[PDB]
Amino acid sequence: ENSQSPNIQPLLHTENLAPAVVDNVKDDLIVSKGGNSRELARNVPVNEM
Amino acid sequence: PNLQMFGHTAEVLVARFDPSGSYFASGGMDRQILLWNVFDVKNYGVLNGCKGAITDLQWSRDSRVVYCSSSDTHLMSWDAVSGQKIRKHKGHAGVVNALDVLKVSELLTSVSDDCTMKVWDSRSKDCIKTIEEKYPLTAVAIAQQGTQVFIGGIDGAIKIWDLRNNHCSHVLKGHKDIITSLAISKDGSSLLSNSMDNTVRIFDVKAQRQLQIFEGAIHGQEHNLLGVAWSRNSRFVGAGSSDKNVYVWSATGDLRYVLPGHEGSVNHVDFHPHQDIILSCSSDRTIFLGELN
Amino acid sequence: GTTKMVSLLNHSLNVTTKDGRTFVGQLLAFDGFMNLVLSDCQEYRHEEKRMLGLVILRGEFIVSLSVQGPPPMLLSGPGVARPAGRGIPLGQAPVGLA
């Protein structure tokens, strides 16, 4: 009972820490990259800017 | 996109959408209100006549009649379908600074440098009421109910007046200096306010204390009246500043979007009624439509 | 005077006469004697009706008047748009100071 529960919770939570962080960071850089170098055409939050 | 449309000759002040979300109107020192489309972003009528510079537009809630607040006492009225004059609401003995409208498009409130608030009917051509304070007034807002009218002056004291009583019911406190724009939510439950202390404070309508003091949007020597708005949800707050930046807040007390783009001081920021767009105007003669995907 | 009477022009009217009969239709022409001209007229003698057409009543014959229904029925300014851009300023602080 305790062994099967610990496997499913680790599977649900830990899976998004690796690829989803890098994929969203790349899409954040890509919108800024498509925005050019000296003109923020992508409307990003102040912290990410 | 963003869309930075050019058109005006001189400092533009006010730019607003219809209640529907299908047009802009804009007009400042030009003495020319210039109507626009939203979705092929082209001009329409050159509403010509105002012999003072414009300080405030507001669409009638029919999306047809437009109202101005010139620097020569007039408050004009325009048929946005045809583009003809209707009236010249002649009253004040000085420069008007703000306007506000109701649900019922019939009643209007204006604010002079005579220290006089005045409520207008769109049928009489004269004043219904005349509330004389003392120091020249600047910003006004009327509630959705058609009951409470908020006045903003030079004392930093946003006074509240009803249409039945006409008594100094309540006075907002803790604002050290100058008010440039009031703004009631789409609930009728809270104001926004730009002071010259750069504290873009929110207030309550009913107990009547503060909510959240926002801080980070400077006014300086220019002495333009800067604006604030409530977003269609009432999640976001959009305050412009003389730092060329549109400081959008999170309404939880967090700066999210701070987008530059203008080369001069910003005036009246707005929001579209449904889709997330931001009208931002500035002495510069330019205007943006900042979006969120 | 007759300022009010011009305001009624081209409205569907309900006109009671001294006989009791009541005519109905739009108002095309009007007089100083209150001669009315009426278009597409219908008497209601009283559960009754008749079609006449164009009717010209005298002043003697008319009693009262009453509206049934309402009257029947800047090209492009200088402004131009552009696309995007959103330049960053090196400096901060207000516009006039420096």
Q: Which helix H or strand E contains B25, and what residues bound it?
A: strand B23-27
Report the 10 Å Cβ neighbour count for B228.
Answer: 27
Cα distance between residue C35 and residue C29, in whole Å:
8
Cα angle B228, B229, B233; round to 5: 155
Cα-trace Rg, chain C: 30
**Chain B: closest CA distance from residue A37 (Å):** 14
End-to-end CA distance of chain B: 10
Q: Which helix H or strand E contains B107, and what residues bound it?
A: strand B107-111
User: C87 and chain A: CB distance < 8 Å anywhere?
Assistant: yes
Partners of A49 on chain B (C-beta within 8 Å) are: 258
CB-nearest to C82 from B3, B44, B222 is: B3
AA identity, residue B135: Y
**C53: alpha, beta or left, given left = phi > 0 and alpha = psi -120 to 50?**
left
**Chain B: closest CA distance from residue C28 (Å):** 28
Cα distance between residue B188 and residue B266, in whole Å:
26
- DSSP string for B132-192: E-SS---EEEE-SSS-EEEEE-SSS--EEEETTT-S--EE-----S-EEEE---SSSSEEE
Pairing of the two strands B43-48 and B58-59? unpaired
**Chain B: closest CA distance from residue A16 (Å):** 23
Q: Where are the domains of chain B?
A: 1-293
Partners of C92 on chain B (C-beta within 8 Å) are: 243
Tokens of B181: 């724009």
Partners of A40 on chain C (C-beta within 8 Å) are: 86, 88
> Can you tell me which residue has the tokens 């800024």?
A32
Q: Are B225 and B239 in contact (CB under 8 A)?
A: no
Tokens of B266: 């910003």
Task: Find the chain A residues whose C-beta atoms sit closer than 8 A to any C-beta of B.
Answer: 40-41, 43-46, 49
Longest pairwise C-alpha distance within chain C: 91
CB-nearest to A41 from B2, B257, B292 is: B2
Tokens of B10: 């001189």
What is the interface size between B and C, counted as CB pairs within 8 Å? Answer: 87
User: A37 and chain C: CB distance < 8 Å anywhere?
Assistant: no
Tokens of B109: 């409130």
> Can you tell me which residue has the tokens 């929110």?
B202
Cα distance between residue B235 and residue A36, in whole Å:
30
Resolution in angstroms, to 1 decimal, for this deposition? 3.6
The residue among B194, B225, B7 whose CA lies nearest residue B95 is B225
φ/ψ of residue A6, rounded to 5:
-70, -30
Q: Are B281 and B12 in contact (CB under 8 A)?
A: yes
**Chain A: closest CA distance from residue C93 (Å):** 17
User: B260 and chain A: CB distance < 8 Å anywhere?
Assistant: yes
Q: Are B115 and B136 in contact (CB under 8 A)?
A: yes
As a dihedral over the C-alpha atoms of residue B246, residue B252, residue B254, residue B256, rounded to 10 degrees, the angle is: -50
Tokens of B170: 């309540």
What is the interface size between A and C, counted as CB pairs within 8 Å? Answer: 12
Q: In Å, what is the CA distance from A36 to each residue of A42, B147, B293?
A: 9, 51, 18
Cα distance between residue B75 and residue B120, in whole Å:
10
Cα distance between residue A11 and residue B45, in whole Å:
62
Do residue B259 and residue A45 have CB atoms under 8 angstroms apart?
A: no
Tokens of B182: 């009031």
* SS3 of residue A9 by DSSP: helix
Helix %, strand %, coil % for chain A, to 5? 60, 0, 40
Q: In Å, what is the CA distance from B170 to each residue of B21, B79, B143?
A: 34, 37, 15
Q: Are B98 and B69 in contact (CB under 8 A)?
A: yes
* SS3 of residue B44 by DSSP: strand
Q: In Å, what is the CA distance from B51 to each residue of B48, B192, B223?
A: 9, 31, 22
Q: Which helix H or strand E contains B247, and what residues bound it?
A: strand B246-249
Report the 10 Å Cβ neighbour count for B201.
Answer: 22
Q: Are B65 and B33 in contact (CB under 8 A)?
A: no
DSSP code at position C71: P
Q: Where are the domains of chain C?
A: 1-98
- DSSP string for B250-278: -SSS-EEEEE---SS-EEEE---SSS-EE
- DSSP string for B61-118: TTSSEEE---SSS--EEEETTT--EEEE----SS---EEEE-----EEEEE-SSSEEE
Cα distance between residue B14 and residue B55, in whole Å:
7
User: B2 and chain A: CB distance < 8 Å anywhere?
Assistant: yes
Q: Are B293 and B274 in contact (CB under 8 A)?
A: no
> Can you tell me which residue has the tokens 């305050």?
B239
Q: Are B167 and B179 in contact (CB under 8 A)?
A: no
Q: Provide CB contacts within 8 A for B54, sequence distance 6+.
A: B13, B14, B27, B28, B29, B30, B31, B33, B68, B69, B70, B71
Do residue C87 and residue A41 have CB atoms under 8 angstroms apart?
A: no
Cα distance between residue B270 and residue B288, in whole Å:
10
Half-sphere exposure in the Cβ direction for B151 (13 Å, CA) = 30
The residue among B150, B171, B93, B153 whose CA lies nearest residue B127 is B93
Closest-CA residue of C relative to B241 is C94
Partners of C97 on chain B (C-beta within 8 Å) are: 220-221
Q: In Å, what is the CA distance from A11 to each residue of A2, A6, A8, B19?
A: 15, 9, 5, 49
Looking at domain B1-293, its CATH superfamily turns out to be YVTN repeat-like/Quinoprotein amine dehydrogenase (2.130.10.10)
